[PDB]
Design a protein around this ligand. Structure first.
Ligand code: AUB
Ligand code: AUB
Lengths: 546, 546
């Protein structure tokens, strides 16, 4: 009974196989067949390549040794090498052209989700080339999806030596019959097979995967579109910035490149961006997923005014001051979405680009109170219910598990009616005590929000709604301004509070405004439609936030 | 009696004054005198410029309004503007050319160190230009050195209106007679003077500063070279990465750009890089100042083997994996210096560039035990004293204040003899119980190390020395390798343990090796010679680590 799956890198997890460059280069340079491949493997276990793969020498130390071997092979074959022939050039092109074999990684991901222990066993080198980063990046993306990465140059052993296979079994803590071994080289499969492991000679991915699903009894081939990579809270880098003596802000940080500050809505967490964090980091960005003031590990002072937009924005500026960031791209959802438009309005020098999910830019009406403006919309009734301190806190904190399960639902899953909330007496009047689990969330994900909300509760989060007059007065100072920095508005078809039509007049204030739209998407955009959110944000970031 | 100093930005803290572009552009374009200056101030308090400075409109909204004013002024003067005349072009050039007035900032720094409350009061705009970052960066560098920054566009008030001066007094919590007000515009000084404040019309910095020192009774002019900016632990972003279930690594993070990982020595802290952190962040780097395993907020497991170079290096690789960093430039001092050469040897794909302070790259002697090799040098005796678990811990933890005060000393301040330590019985046998404070450190700085060492003590730190045989066996695997990635070796003339001559044969292993050298520098390089360390590292980073 199989419990582990082992994959090679070259020709298995990454395509095209770097070994294949030698065959094509020979064919392009009209060189004799197998000349480059024979000079590469010249000397066998005592040769320059085995020394490289064992970690005795580095790639740059190997280049002149392979050049000698190529000259020796051309001398014997009675042929001449071209005038400007370069092994570094050939290898640089072979490595940079090699990409992740997405369907193989998907199959590995599926086997791990199903309880398998997964590992990458590869014959590789210590790369000290000027362009080593390309390969470094490839390995980083791949490695994080496996339980183990065994590299020949790090263990001082090489395939097909039987020692690396016993090392693999020991690392795995599994007997050979419990292991599937995927490799594109038949000579490297023999020892695993000879040990008793299930082996798959990988030629085309499709057949390899067909052989894989047959031996595992798990569907891997032509299975549905997987959700993007999520975040395990314990594996993240956690950052803490004191913005004021009583106020500290917490954030999760991943990636390198231009700073992308993610601002969640109500009643959420940095974890609301769980499906965007690994994707924006992989796309070339330094993501900073905030716990906004009043939430999770961020401070939650009790006073209402600590949560007005003026104070929240000043503290986000200080957060950048203390981190040594002159700018950041600001991406907000819901209450975070409103915060980001005001960051762009009051601090454009600090905002590289601004993006909002669901929340339109809504300019203050100087001829009307916000309480009047709220009353004009029946869908906004819950905001009046949120006004009296203590009332919504007591109902939302009574059963944390019920609160998040009732709230975090897809458009066809609604168990809550946000209309006539005040007259009913509460948010959960004709709502189930034990709501069903939404298809958007797992029990574990809901429990992370429950755990987060145990520290400060709902006072701080609800205080974001308790500054209408203060926010209105502050917003009126910006009534003659326009948003002229790069800006993205993303609407969600099925958000029944923040309806797409609420964003219709945004171009009057933001003329160069770019847009995105998500159909069959409810209020909880990031977890409802993570794949499309990632696609819209990444495309916009690369074009406008550089 | 003066207690506060207020400085304007344009023409005072930053030169050349942006107002001066209008005069030079007129002169370059052979335009009538004062034409650009008159169109800029056109309409006075009701004009486009006052609206800009009050925050009613943004800079990009202002550009076409200034263009109208310029056309109106040319129409009256009966002159024509050039065919490709652009206010955006003129202003972009004026802003980017404007730099910090270093001697004025130094005087502000000196007044604050002497107990003054300092502030920047400036007439400024909301900058939404594509090139706003240049100005954002300028303000970030400057603002962090003052208690307050009052910007006209944020307070909705402008100089010379008397309201901004009463707002300043209220922000300051000082009466007018306690305030020095520095401004390059006489019209903007009048209200401060009329209120009773000491005022200085700033023309040339030298005279302004001469007037400043006379009224303050504090030497500001031609005073010694100041130490680089240091770090206040409470104002930093603190990062936490779990690398293994029992091991968490702590770091301080500042700046944006290529990742620079700083690795301290024994018995130190991230705080040993206090003078390098703000300088490398200002030079365009994302600094990650580590608390190495066994130190400060990083985990300190008790077992000896948790501190061998193989485990320490693997955990630094994981630290990069979890932060989403494919590479980092690795800069080490002392034990951190040794760790970084081994990072370059075993993980060149993860190391962008490598730099060491004092620690040479020393390749393992396969024909000798490290215990034998240590005994060959009388200056290395303390390492044998460090071997027996508990002995050096008990002596180093007995009096934390004494330990750091005795250790952290300049070359002419030595109170400790590291020779014949074993025979004497300890590290502090003929050492004072109450050592004098070194000129390199303050009492507050020593107390930060005392506080840090109260958590785990010296077991973890001392365990770095207790893996000689293990480190030796591991290092022998790299005996055929060369360091071919960018590398910097920095020697300190007066380091009597890690003598510059110990680095003499490094080019045999690292042929492209670059060097730096610091004279009159002891073991504690970063705090001994911070200015020269910053100059050497910054110059090397910009040339080799890009
Ligand atoms: O109220 C705001 N968020 C709510 C958070 C809770 C959610 O509850 C839901 C959502 C969906 C469902 C479902 O499908 O069953 C049920 C309950 C409703 C939206 N957002 C703002 C954002 C800005 C600033 C201010 C005024 C205006 C513009 C709306 C708050
Ligand atoms: O021992 C190492 N650091 C000491 C830390 C304490 C300091 O104590 C001092 C220093 C100066 C003074 C003074 O001026 O009074 C007094 C005491 C002496 C140096 N560094 C290593 C770094 C690598 C790896 C291993 C072997 C070799 C190479 C030396 C440890």
């Amino acid at each position: 009974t199989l419990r582990a799956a082992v994959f090679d890198l070259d020709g298995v997890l990454a395509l095209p196989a770097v070994f294949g460059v030698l065959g094509r280069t020979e064919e392009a340079l009209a060189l004799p067949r197998g000349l480059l491949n024979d000079a590469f493997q010249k000397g066998g276990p005592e040769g320059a390549t085995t020394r490289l793969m064992k970690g005795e020498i580095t790639l740059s130390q190997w280049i002149p040794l392979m050049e000698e071997n190529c000259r020796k092979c051309s001398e014997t074959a009675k042929v001449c090498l071209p005038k400007n022939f370069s092994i570094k050039e050939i290898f640089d092109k072979a490595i940079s052209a090699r990409k992740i074999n997405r369907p193989m990684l998907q199959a590995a991901l599926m086997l791990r989700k199903k309880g398998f222990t997964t590992a990458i066993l590869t014959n590789t080198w210590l790369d000290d080339r000027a362009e080593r980063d390309g390969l470094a990046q490839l390995m980083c993306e791949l490695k994080m999806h496996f339980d183990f990465l065994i590299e020949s140059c790090q263990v001082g052993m090489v395939k097909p030596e039987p020692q690396i296979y016993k090392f693999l079994l020991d690392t795995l803590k599994a007997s050979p019959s419990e292991v599937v071994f995927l490799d594109d080289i038949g000579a490297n499969l023999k020892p695993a097979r000879d040990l008793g492991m299930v082996t798959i000679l990988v030629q085309d991915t499709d057949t390899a995967l067909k052989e894989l699903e047959k031996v595992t009894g798990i569907q891997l081939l032509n299975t549905p579109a997987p959700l993007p990579t999520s975040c395990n809270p314990s594996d993240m880098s956690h950052g803490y910035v004191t913005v004021k003596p009583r106020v500290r802000l917490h954030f999760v940080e991943l990636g390198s490149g231009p700073a992308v500050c993610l601002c969640h809505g109500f009643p959420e967490s940095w974890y609301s961006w769980r499906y965007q964090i690994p994707a924006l980091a992989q796309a070339g960005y330094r993501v900073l997923a905030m716990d906004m003031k009043g939430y999770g590990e961020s401070s939650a002072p009790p006073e209402i005014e600590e949560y007005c937009m003026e104070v929240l924005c000043k503290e986000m500026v200080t957060f950048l001051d203390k981190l040594g960031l002159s700018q950041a791209v600001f991406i907000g959802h819901d209450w975070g979405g409103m915060l980001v438009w005001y960051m762009a309005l009051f601090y454009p020098e600090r905002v590289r680009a601004v993006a909002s999910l669901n929340t339109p830019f809504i300019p203050a009406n100087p001829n009307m109170s916000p309480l009047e403006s709220i009353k004009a919309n029946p869908v906004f009734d819950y905001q009046l219910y949120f006004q009296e301190p203590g009332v919504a806190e007591a109902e939302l904190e009574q059963n944390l598990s019920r609160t998040f399960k009732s709230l975090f639902r897809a458009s066809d899953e609604s168990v809550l009616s946000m209309h006539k909330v005040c007259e009913a007496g509460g948010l959960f009047v004709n709502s189930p005590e034990e709501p069903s689990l939404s298809r958007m969330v797992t029990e574990e994900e809901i429990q992370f929000y429950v755990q987060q909300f145990k520290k400060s509760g709902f006072r701080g989060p609800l205080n974001w709604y308790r500054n209408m007059e203060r926010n209105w007065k502050w917003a009126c100072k910006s009534l003659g301004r326009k948003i002229l920095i790069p800006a993205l508005m993303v609407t969600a078809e099925k958000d029944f509070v923040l309806v797409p039509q609420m964003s219709q007049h945004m171009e009057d204030w933001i003329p160069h405004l770019k847009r995105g739209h998500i159909e069959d998407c409810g209020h909880w955009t990031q977890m409802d439609k993570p794949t499309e959110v990632n696609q819209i944000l990444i495309k916009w970031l690369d074009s406008d936030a550089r």
